[PDB]
Amino acid sequence: AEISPYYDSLLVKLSTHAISFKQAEEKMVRSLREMRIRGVKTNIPFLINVMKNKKFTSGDYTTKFIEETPELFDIQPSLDRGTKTLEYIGNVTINGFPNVEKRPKPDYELASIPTVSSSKIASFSGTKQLLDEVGPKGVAEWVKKQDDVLLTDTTFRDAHQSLLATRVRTKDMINIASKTADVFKDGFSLEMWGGATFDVAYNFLKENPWERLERLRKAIPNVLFQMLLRASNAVGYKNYPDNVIHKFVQESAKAGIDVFRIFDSLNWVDQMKVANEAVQEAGKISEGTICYTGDILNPERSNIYTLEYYVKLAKELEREGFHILAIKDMAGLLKPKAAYELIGELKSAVDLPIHLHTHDTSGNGLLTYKQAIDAGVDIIDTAVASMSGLTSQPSANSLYYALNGFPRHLRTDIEGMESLSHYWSTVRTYYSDFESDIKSPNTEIYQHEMPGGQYSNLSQQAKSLGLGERFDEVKDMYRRVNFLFGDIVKVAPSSKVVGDMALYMVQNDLDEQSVITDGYKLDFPESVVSFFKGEIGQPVNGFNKDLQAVILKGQEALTARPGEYLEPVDFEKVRELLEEEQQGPVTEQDIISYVLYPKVYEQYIQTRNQYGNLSLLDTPTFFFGMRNGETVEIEIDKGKRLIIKLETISEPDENGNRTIYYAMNGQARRIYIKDENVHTNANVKPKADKSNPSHIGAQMPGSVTEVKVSVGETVKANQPLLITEAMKMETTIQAPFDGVIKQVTVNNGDTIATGDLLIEIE
């Protein structure tokens, strides 16, 4: 029952008693701190401050105690972890989750999780202990000495970035972290950060990527952690001054990143200097990356992307002092024989160890690795079977066995990998709504060279513009655009440019000649003009001067890398703003996260405040909430867990607000959530008090044809304030007296019943 303003406010009278004023005083604050009341505001924190006060415990106080002691009106805000958790689950349960097919929470395969004792893990000495031991130069020398092929696992990052739109949550990663540590004990590194994970973590999954790094760090303390770093903007979405790259690297290194794979999306070395330096100042392993395009086997493909180009480029990265050479075949273009010829040459040309990354999108992935191994490659990127294949990395499980009887062994634990594979197979089930369109190998890759996902993304995009029946022309145009722009390396964001241009040309019946002829009256996509302004950097062959002109419409292009144009970011100012906007506890990781993703980060916070740490929810609960009678067990910390039981959900009231009946570990609990019905008619109206002159009720079942009044309208008696529909008959409801409307229980089109409250007038 609610509170009337007609009697003095007494919620509860609280009294404590013990041997001494000290013991009764600490008996009081204890009972005060357990006290929890909601729906109204209380004087609780006030008294808490009073009791705690040394002058009160002193006993010397007078009546002037409150007026003289100004700390007593300085009370700190009271969040509630538990309520916000109930609020989230309630919302998702009733109104679903974005891009998740509204369906009852599925009953997945149990498939219990393999774990390894942390004291055992602490005894492991792997490549992480080797970095701490011999430095980044020494890890490299160690690698090139290893006869076995060393693997990098990509399950925590690229694997699901390809197959699951990067939706794999920290929760599922942390769950196998300890097993993974044992399984990949002799692995070179785990790729668990960068690419889209930063962005997607904060935005979609609403979890802190820094937490993911930090927690995996503690759980897997023996293997090198690796991230993918884009030379121009680390992990952002636009351009940044050099001090933003530096900050992010310093703070990435501190939180557990050991190996940074640095790549430019045009293979432009000059845009790779900043990241390189930064990584070196952090004393971490910097991996210098060549992206693969063209086909060194076929001399008709390019006069540019030849064996001699990659050799030249590799040696420049060596003189730049990268510890390791990475080949990033982001589109799976490296054909088996090409692999053997490219690696072989690269071994002879540079002294750096070679680290090879491919996608299995053609279906020749394992063959490529096998050939690379034959040619002497030091490290390859693999994924566990169930998270491998197609646009993902080649399977580690099968590479293992594919190598049987050949002169070189893949150094890992298969037994472990089978187990990891099983775990990842059940978990992948949770992410079924984010499965790729692609279910089959695709060798048209070799002509259009669309990296990773795009050949589906772009089909989706082409269907949006109604070119669904003409995708072959789009794929044809993509290839032409590549030559039109001078034959460029195609990885994000350069590949976006070509796709945009291609869509644009097919949609506008444009070819290579008309794009120049009509170009004065064409609004070219922002991504291409941006690309032709110098904003992704310099493409190998430069810009065609006339094509540049027509697209730029007289705008200047950059004469240097995007970086040198921008002011260093004032980070003190960033801290100032954040500390004002938020409570007080702000960190460097907060600071660059804001810098890198302002709007996204701001949204992460508004979500943290409202719902707490969502990353601690098990994934089914996160996407579906809870069903009736279910009990879920949320791990907050070691020894701290919330046991929640959803008992029932009521029908919605006259506001579309439904009442959820929970039990939160031993306690009855009720929460309210607004239900977006999709149409409105199912709302439960309160029954009018009949012997109450204010309460106007419904005389008949009907509909609300029109609403004429709202809360706070004053018109005389007989005013036509609500039009109803009896049974194809309109009756105009009129006021009994001159007065003011307090509540309107209905909106246009709501079904009404006999004796339902509609209007209250004073």
Least Å distance, CB 753 to another protein, is 41
Neighbouring residues of 287: CB distance < 8 A, sequence distance ≥ 6: 226, 259, 260, 261, 262, 322, 323, 324, 325, 326, 355
Neighbours of 643 (CB within 10 A): 12
Give me the 381-420 binding string for its own copies, x by CB under 8 A, dash otherwise.
xxxxxxxxxxxxxxxxxx-xxxxxxx-xxxxxxx-xxxxx
Least Å distance, CB 658 to ligand BTI, is 14
Cβ–Cβ < 8 Å for 256, 220: no
Question: Which of the residues 669 through 698 are near its own copies (CB under 8 A)?
Answer: 678-681, 687, 690-691, 693, 696
Q: Which does 299 bind (CB under 5 to 8 A by kind): ligand BTI, Mn ion, another protein, none?
A: none
Closer CB to Mn ion, 290 or 673, in the complex: 290
Residues in the chain: 762
CA distance 450 to 458: 9
Instruction: Please report whether residue 287 would count as binding Mn ion according to CB under 5 A.
Output: no
- For ligand BTI, the binding residues (CB under 6 A) are 91-92, 95, 97-98, 204, 206, 607, 728
Cβ–Cβ < 8 Å for 334, 296: no
Instruction: Please report whether residue 708 would count as binding its own copies according to CB under 8 A.
Output: no
Least Å distance, CB 359 to Mn ion, is 6
Owner of token pair 């992480």: 128
Question: Which of the residues 109 through 168 are near another protein (CB under 8 A)?
Answer: none
- Which span sits near its own copies by CB under 8 A: 70-78, 143-151, 225-233, 559-567? 143-151
- Which span sits near Mn ion by CB under 5 A: 151-159, 529-537, 572-580, 674-682? 151-159
Q: Which listed residue (87, 153, 158, 760) binds Mn ion by CB under 5 A?
A: 158
Least Å distance, CB 97 to ligand BTI, is 6
If phi > 0 it is left, if psi is from -120 to 50 it is alpha, else beta; for residue 135 that is left
Q: Which does 619 bind (CB under 5 to 8 A by kind): ligand BTI, Mn ion, another protein, none?
A: none
Question: Which of the residues 662 through 691 are near another protein (CB under 8 A)?
Answer: 665-667
Closer CB to ligand BTI, 610 or 631, in the complex: 610
Judged by CB under 8 A, the number of residues near its own copies is: 177
CB-side exposure of 648: number of CA atoms within 13 Å? Answer: 3
Residue 499: strand, helix, or coil: helix
Question: Could you give phi then psi for residue 466, rounded to 5 degrees?
Answer: 75, 25
Least Å distance, CB 676 to its own copies, is 8
Question: Which of the residues 196 through 225 are near another protein (CB under 8 A)?
Answer: none
Q: Which does 680 bind (CB under 5 to 8 A by kind): Mn ion, ligand BTI, another protein, none?
A: none
Cβ–Cβ < 8 Å for 563, 274: yes
Q: Is the peptide bond before 493 cis (omega within 30 degrees of 0)?
A: yes
Least Å distance, CB 166 to its own copies, is 9
Tokens of residue 132, six digits: 């701490």
CA distance 428 to 440: 18
Question: Which of the residues 604 through 663 are near another protein (CB under 8 A)?
Answer: 638-641, 643
CB-side exposure of 729: number of CA atoms within 13 Å? Answer: 6
739 forms bridges with which residues in the sheet? 715
Question: Which of the residues 441 through 470 are near its own copies (CB under 8 A)?
Answer: 441-444, 446, 452-453, 463-469
Cβ–Cβ < 8 Å for 446, 331: no
Closer CB to its own copies, 260 or 292, in the complex: 292
Q: Counting Cβ atoms within 10 Å, is residue 455 exposed (0-12), middle (13-18) or buried (19+)?
A: buried
CA distance 244 to 277: 13
Tell me the CA distances in angstroms from 40 to 11, 36, 72, 131, one per residue in order. 10, 11, 20, 57
Instruction: Please report whether residue 36 would count as binding another protein according to CB under 8 A.
Output: no
Least Å distance, CB 660 to another protein, is 20
Q: Which listed residue (86, 93, 184, 194) binds its own copies by CB under 8 A?
A: 184
CA distance 350 to 59: 81
Q: Which does 686 bind (CB under 5 to 8 A by kind): another protein, its own copies, ligand BTI, none?
A: none
Q: Which listed residue (3, 9, 11, 30) binds another protein by CB under 8 A?
A: 30
Instruction: Using CA atoms of 277, 281, 284, 290 in order, give the dihedral in degrees to the nearest 10.
Output: 0
Closer CB to another protein, 98 or 639, in the complex: 639
Question: Which of the residues 201 through 260 are near its own copies (CB under 8 A)?
Answer: none
CB-side exposure of 517: number of CA atoms within 13 Å? Answer: 6
Closer CB to its own copies, 257 or 342, in the complex: 342
Q: Which does 92 bind (CB under 5 to 8 A by kind): ligand BTI, its own copies, Mn ion, none?
A: ligand BTI
CA distance 637 to 467: 52
> What does the binding site for another protein look like in residue numbers (CB under 8 A)?
23, 26-27, 30, 638-641, 643, 665-667
> What does the binding site for Mn ion look like in residue numbers (CB under 5 A)?
158
